[PDB]
Structures are given as C-alpha cells and as structure tokens.
Enzyme design. Structure first.
Site, PDB file in Angstrom:
ATOM      1  N   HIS A  21       4.059 -36.322  10.264  1.00  0.00           N
ATOM      2  CA  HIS A  21       3.400 -35.951   9.014  1.00  0.00           C
ATOM      3  C   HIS A  21       2.139 -35.115   9.223  1.00  0.00           C
ATOM      4  CE1 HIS A  21       1.530 -36.214   4.994  1.00  0.00           C
ATOM      5  NE2 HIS A  21       2.781 -36.295   4.586  1.00  0.00           N
TER       6      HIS A  21
ATOM      7  N   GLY B  58      -0.735 -31.945  -1.536  1.00  0.00           N
ATOM      8  CA  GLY B  58      -1.827 -32.463  -2.366  1.00  0.00           C
ATOM      9  C   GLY B  58      -2.630 -31.446  -3.164  1.00  0.00           C
TER      10      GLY B  58
END
Lengths: 246, 247
Positions: free
Chosen positions: B94, B170
C-alpha cells in the site's frame, strides 16, 4: 519507593493456542504486591490477550501512531489501544528504531500523543556497539532521553527502558555493573533536568538479556527498577523474573 | 471463465469497536450480489473482532504483515497470526506503507512470497506519484513494481493486483475511466508477456484512488478494470453502491 516493574515483550511470537497456555500460567501466578506486571502481545492479539488475562496484569501495545484516526494503512492509535482495554504502549523500541527506522522526532511525537490520550508509556533508549566503542554512550542515551522528556508533562505515567543494543547478537554482553552504571547516569539526568522528585519516583528498567538465572543480581542494583523482558516472557521463567525482588 | 468482480474496503486507521460494529451491521444487512467478491481490511487491533461480527459472505484482510512466521520484530504481525484470527487476505505494498513508512520493493516482495507460502490471498498494491506522472514515467514505475511482486508469486489464483496512483489517494482526484483502463490494459499486457496468457486472462486488476458511488459505474464497465480498492468511501453507506457497480 519506586514500585518494581516487570514488562514482558512477546514481540512477533505466538498464536491463540500457545498464548492461551502462557496466559493460563500467568493467571495462576501469585504476583508480588510490590511488583507491577505488564504484557505486550502482538498487535492482532491485544484484544484477545486483555480478554484472557486476569486484571492483576496490565496489557501494552508494542507500538502506535501519532494521531487518533487517519489514512495510515497498517497502524493503530492510542484510542484503539484504550478501546481494547490496554493501558500502556511501548515506544522507541530498538527494533522500531533500528530495523524499521523510526526517528527520535517521530518517537517523541508518538510519546506526546499517547500520553495526551491517557496511556502509559514505556519509552525505550540505548546505544549501538559502534557508539559504545567510540565513548559516546552518555551522549546517545542523554539525547534520546531529552527528546522523550520534551514530550512528557507527567512522569507518573512513564517508565524508561535502557536497551544495551550493543549487546544484541554482537559478541559482547553487558554485566550488572555496566547496566547499573548507565541507570545511575540516567537517574542523575532526571534529577538535573526535571526534578529531584521525578528522579526518585521514576522507574528505569533494564532492557537487555535477563533470565531466571540473572534477574536477582540485576534487580539488586540500586538504580535498576525492573525489566523489559524479551525471550523469557514467553515462558514460565517469566514468573521467576516477576519474583526477582522476593 | 470470466473474472469475478472484486471490491475491497480498506478502513485504514479508523474506527473503534462501537463505530466499526455499526459499519459491519450495515454491510451484513446489505444485499451482496453473487459474482462479487467483497473483502474488508480493518485496523490490525480489530482483525479478530471484525471477523467475528462480519457475515461469512464478506472476507477479512489484514492491512499489512511481516516476512517471517515469528521473531524479534516488536510491532509486527505474521501471516500465521492473520490466519489464526480468521482472515484470508493481506494488503501488501500500500502507498502509505511505501511512502509514509518507507517500505522498499525488496521488502514488499519478501512479504508477498511469505504471505502466499502461508496460504493467504494477497492484494498487492502498485502506483505512481504525481511527479512520476508529470515526468511521463508511470509505465516504467508500475512495471518495475509489478516485476518485484511477480518474481515472488508462484500461484496467481490467490493474488489481486491493485493499481492506485498516489495522486488519486484521498485527494478527490479519481482517475477517469480512460486513465484507469489505459494503465490496466498495459499491466495486463505485462502479465501476458512476462508470466503467461492464462495469468493475464484470469487475474483481477482492480483500481483504487477516490472511488465513489458517483464514479464506480463508468470505471467498472471498462473491460480491463475488474473491481476496486476503496478507502474513504468504504467507511460510508455508498460502499454498497460500489459493491453493486455492475448491476
């Protein structure tokens, strides 16, 4: 006087079955009234460990991050730690600093956030072999301690752990005299840079190799207030170390 | 055999037992289509909890692990611990691991091999940063990242590849359907020419980076986009809409 403190750091070891067996042994152990006992399970078992362990033993997370919630895949917050019923967190452990590269700056910010959120902190420091052999033990540990001190308002909630990282798999080992030397040094630092009251009330625990064989002698050192235990914490031997002052 | 649609929800560092209990109640109440594989990744302190509360239709994933079964790695967990907790997947590589916590490609490749050796599914993440995009080396970066993963994979049936450009994570700047499809087509071409044609045809390549209820349908209909890895929206009611993106 300073209450004797025995932390068991399980590190990345165990499964529900084997940890269940360990917990049974610790639940059965008569823990001395003058000794505070804390176990730090792997992160996936904080909840499980708190569910199975008797209230007499407190639970610590092995690490945390520095905000309450966020986009930090694979991290946990003090809020989650408290939510699982744990009351402590280990910060600045040698493996975090030297395997995973956590800076003093990051560690200090973690310490401030954990304490503000109402956790206790076991704050680790220590020098590597090159550093010891270059004469700068006192420098390294004083600086690491200063960063921690800059982020501590109330020392009633902190324990200081000295890890002789120079003795980890290197071909050297620390004697009880060598550990006592560094602990006395640190208590004098607390006396000088914060207060006499904090110097005399704060537990400074030994984070090097400790076993059933060696714990009584180390514990008898005037400035050694307990241990952060590695491998022996996964065995019944841990209770000998809990009994070190008896 | 058509590739089964795959939706993963990465809760990241969010929630407590009460709020995650509510999120789970919603997911349990939700109508999950057959031929949709749904996987939720809770914070590490809540893997065990999540698996107990969640319906068996939804699988559980860890957000990270280390590369050996046990050892002197304070703060880490192993694949063995993840299985012991009832989870069947782990998210590896990630963006936040790579770029906030400095995990190298070498380390990530070691974790993949070990996780697969232990019987876990892996959601293996790749993607380029904004400066890499604006220097025109997206393809280079994502191919090199896929190579390290591929060199550590012996059975692709347990792997899902997740393309997540860092500038989309995000930020609200979700990739357009063309942008996504373009990278996924080339990644699938890489698999064909470097591993096998069987692997290229069968392997899910999922998109992540500001996936929403409003964006999922057009991304899902693209032929080489096989599903999603969802961050922010996985904490919200619209995750159910992302689950139903092909209905």
């Amino acid at each position: 006087s300073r209450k004797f403190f025995v932390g068991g750091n399980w590190k990345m070891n165990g499964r529900k079955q084997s940890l269940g067996e360990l917990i049974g042994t610790l639940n059965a152990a008569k823990v001395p009234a003058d000794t505070e006992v804390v176990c730090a399970p792997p992160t996936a078992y904080i909840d499980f460990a708190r569910q199975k362990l008797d209230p007499k033993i407190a639970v610590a997370a092995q690490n945390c991050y520095k905000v309450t919630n966020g986009a930090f895949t694979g991290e946990i917050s003090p809020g989650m730690i408290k939510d699982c019923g744990a009351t402590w967190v280990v910060l600045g452990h040698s493996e975090r600093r030297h395997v995973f590269g956590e800076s003093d700056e990051l560690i200090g910010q973690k310490v401030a956030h954990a304490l503000a959120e109402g956790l206790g902190v076991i704050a680790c420091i220590g020098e590597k072999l090159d550093e010891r052999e270059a004469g700068i033990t006192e420098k390294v540990v004083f600086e690491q301690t200063k960063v921690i001190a800059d982020n501590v308002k109330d020392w009633s909630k902190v324990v200081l752990a000295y890890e002789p990282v120079w003795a980890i798999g290197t071909g050297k080992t620390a004697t009880p005299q060598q550990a006592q030397e560094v602990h006395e040094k640190l208590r004098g630092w607390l006396k000088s840079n914060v207060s006499d009251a904090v110097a005399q009330s704060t537990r400074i625990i030994y984070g090097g190799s400790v076993t059933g064989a060696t714990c009584k002698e180390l514990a008898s050192q005037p400035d050694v207030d307990g241990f952060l235990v590695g491998g022996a914490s996964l065995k019944p031997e841990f209770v000998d170390i809990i009994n070190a002052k008896q």
